[PDB]
Structures are given as structure tokens and as C-alpha cells.
Amino acid sequence: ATTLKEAADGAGRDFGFALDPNRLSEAQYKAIADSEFNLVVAENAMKWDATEPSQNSFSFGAGDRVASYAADTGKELYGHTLVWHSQLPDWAKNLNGSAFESAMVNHVTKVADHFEGKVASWDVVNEAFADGGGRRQDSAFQQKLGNGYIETAFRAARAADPTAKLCINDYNVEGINAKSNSLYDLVKDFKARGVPLDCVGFQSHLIVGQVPGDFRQNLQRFADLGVDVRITELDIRMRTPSDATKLATQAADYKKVVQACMQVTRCQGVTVWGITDKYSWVPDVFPGEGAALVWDASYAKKPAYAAVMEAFGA
Numbered sequence: 001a002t003t004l005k006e007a008a009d010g011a012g013r014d015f016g017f018a019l020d021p022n023r024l025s026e027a028q029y030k031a032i033a034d035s036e037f038n039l040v041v042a043e044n045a046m047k048w049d050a051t052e053p054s055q056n057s058f059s060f061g062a063g064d065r066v067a068s069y070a071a072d073t074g075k076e077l078y079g080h081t082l083v084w085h086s087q088l089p090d091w092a093k094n095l096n097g098s099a100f101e102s103a104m105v106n107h108v109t110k111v112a113d114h115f116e117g118k119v120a121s122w123d124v125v126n127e128a129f130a131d132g133g134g135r136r137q138d139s140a141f142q143q144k145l146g147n148g149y150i151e152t153a154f155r156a157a158r159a160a161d162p163t164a165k166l167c168i169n170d171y172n173v174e175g176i177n178a179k180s181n182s183l184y185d186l187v188k189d190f191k192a193r194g195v196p197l198d199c200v201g202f203q204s205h206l207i208v209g210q211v212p213g214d215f216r217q218n219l220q221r222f223a224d225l226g227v228d229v230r231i232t233e234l235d236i237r238m239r240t241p242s243d244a245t246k247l248a249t250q251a252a253d254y255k256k257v258v259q260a261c262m263q264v265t266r267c268q269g270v271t272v273w274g275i276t277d278k279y280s281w282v283p284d285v286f287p288g289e290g291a292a293l294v295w296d297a298s299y300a301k302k303p304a305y306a307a308v309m310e311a312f313g314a
């Protein structure tokens with residue numbers, strides 16, 4: 001293999017990236033997107049703010065651009081995300097009770113219907129749980145609808161799209177801890193009761209030198225509930241600027257994550273949360289952190305690149 005795409009293809013797995021469709025007009029970004037990945041997810045274009053800016057008025061141009069990119073380049077398309085507490089438009093936050101429930105249901109229905117037969121899998125619900133266990137505490141969905149909203153969302157998604165793989169996605173659930181235990185309980189419950197649910201996403205926004213040693217064990221116990229698993233938003237951030245030591249540790253870390261996936265038969269693959277450090281979300285959220293991706297800000301391959309290739313068995 002001479003590309004990460006070839007390595008993943010050869011392994012029978014997915015290697016994806018988070019796309020900003022506006023960056024496709026930057027030819028270097030498009031060249032790498034085209035050649036190095038066999039799956040794409042919209043970094044932002046399919047979120048609620050991006051798709052339903054006012055009640056029952058939809059703006060699918062950006063999401064369609066991502067879908068068309070996937071179809072044109074023959075990549076799997078992964079859908080992110082139907083229900084998420086973050087970036088929720090004010091019009092939705094202003095609704096309550098049944099009016100809010102109906103807005104959620106309408107959103108799930110219209111977005112899943114719009115992309116039906118193009119999007120292969122959806123993050124139906126994103127970030128429902130709390131670090132330390134139990135439900136997230138700053139969510140409009142949890143606060144207005146309570147525990148049942150997750151099941152409502154999954155059933156609505158299946159009603160709209162009978163075949164798409166329906167996933168729940170979260171972060172800080174890579175190791176076995178109170179948060180991933182809560183997520184595990186729900187997955188087991190849903191499968192026991194026949195609630196539509198096909199997959200679990202592990203975001204894997206990790207810090208350099210801190211990959212959970214129990215990641216494989218955790219992925220495996222989820223797979224054993226009878227669902228697929230996926231590493232959905234991998235990046236491994238360090239204190240900037242990078243140096244040789246940090247880049248080597250980061251490379252080792254990428255290898256650890258991709259190997260954990262390789263070691264679990266139902267792990268569909270790994271998606272990294274962007275292409276280049278140039279555009280990574282990390283520096284804006286974490287002051288003085290960054291350099292989290294496989295390409296640097298000048299689109300040079302970092303040591304992480306060879307580590308990913310090696311881990312896919314290339």
C-alpha cells in the first residue's frame with residue numbers, strides 16, 4: 001500500500017475523514033481527500049444548525065455537497081448527526097414539551113428522508129452521556145424530554161430510513177468507565193427490546209500519550225452485544241508546537257487506536273476528524289493544544305501516517 005486508503009481497503013475496513021465541503025476548492029485538500037480515504041462524514045454540514053435554520057425550513061445545499069462528493073469519489077457516506085445538544089438553533093431551544101418533541105421528530109424524519117439511500121449510517125444521537133456516568137446535564141433534549149428521547153429518535157430514524165445503520169456516538173467512552181458503562185447499559189437495553197440500533201461510535205478525541213489500554217476490550221464488549229463499532233472522530237492532540245518526541249508518541253498512539261479496531265471483528269474502521277492541522281477544531285477549544293491530525297498545516301504527512309498504514313496491516 002502507498003496510501004492509507006489502500007491500507008484500509010486491503011484490510012477490509014473503512015478509513016474516513018471529516019469533510020468541510022468549502023475546502024474542496026483548495027486543490028491540495030481535495031487531492032488528499034480523494035486519494036487517502038474510503039469514507040467521508042460531514043464535519044458540520046449535516047448538523048441541525050446547518051440543515052434546519054428555522055422551524056421546518058431546510059437548507060440542504062452544504063450537506064448535499066458532501067453527499068455528492070462521496071458519490072462522485074465512490075466513498076462510503078457516514079451521517080453526523082441528527083440529535084445533539086450542541087449548536088442547537090435558538091428556535092428549537094425556545095420550544096417545550098410536545099412542541100419540542102415534535103420538532104426533534106420532524107428534524108430526524110426530514111433529514112434522514114432527504115439523505116435516504118445516500119447516507120449509509122447515522123449518528124442518530126450524539127453525546128447523550130455524562131463524564132462520570134448517567135445522562136448529560138446540559139442537554140436541551142435531556143432537560144425537555146427526559147430519558148425516553150433517545151429511543152424516540154432511533155425509532156423515528158428507522159421509520160424514515162428502514163435500512164441505514166443507526167448509531168449512537170460519544171466521547172470519553174473509549175475506556176471502560178462510568179460513562180461507557182452507562183452507554184453499554186443503554187445499548188444492551190435497546191437490543192434486548194428490539195429498539196432500532198445497529199452501531200456505536202467512539203469519538204476518540206484523545207490526548208498524546210493517553211490512549212486507554214482497555215480500548216480493545218471495551219470495543220469487544222460492545223460488539224458482543226450484537227452491534228457494530230467504529231472509531232468516529234479520531235485526533236490526538238498535543239501541546240504545540242510539535243517536536244520529534246511528541247510526534248513519535250502521537251504516531252504510536254495512532255497505531256494503538258487503529259490496532260484496537262483491527263483486533264475487533266465488528267469494528268468497521270476509523271474516521272479521523274479532519275485532514276490537516278491547518279483546519280483542526282482543537283486549537284480554538286483548547287488554548288495551546290493542537291497538531292492533532294495526520295497531516296500538518298502545510299499538508300506534509302506526519303509520523304502518524306506511517307503508523308496508521310502499519311496498523312491496517314500494510
Ligand SMILES: OC[C@H]1CNC[C@@H](O)[C@@H]1O[C@@H]1O[C@H](CO)[C@@H](O[C@@H]2O[C@H](CO)[C@@H](O[C@@H]3O[C@H](CO)[C@@H](O)[C@H](O)[C@H]3O)[C@H](O)[C@H]2O)[C@H](O)[C@H]1O
Pocket residue numbers: 043044047086087126203233281
Ligand atoms: O468538538 C469536536 C467534535 C466533538 N464531537 C462531535 C463533533 O461534531 C465535534 O465537531 C466540531 O463541532 C463543532 C460545533 O458544531 C464545530 O465548531 C464550529 O465550527 C464552525 C465552523 O468552523 C464555527 O463557526 C464558523 O466560523 C467561520 C469563520 O471563518 C465561518 O466560515 C463559518 O460560517 C462559521 O459557521 C463555530 O464557531 C464552531 O462552533 C467544529 O468545526 C467541529 O469539528
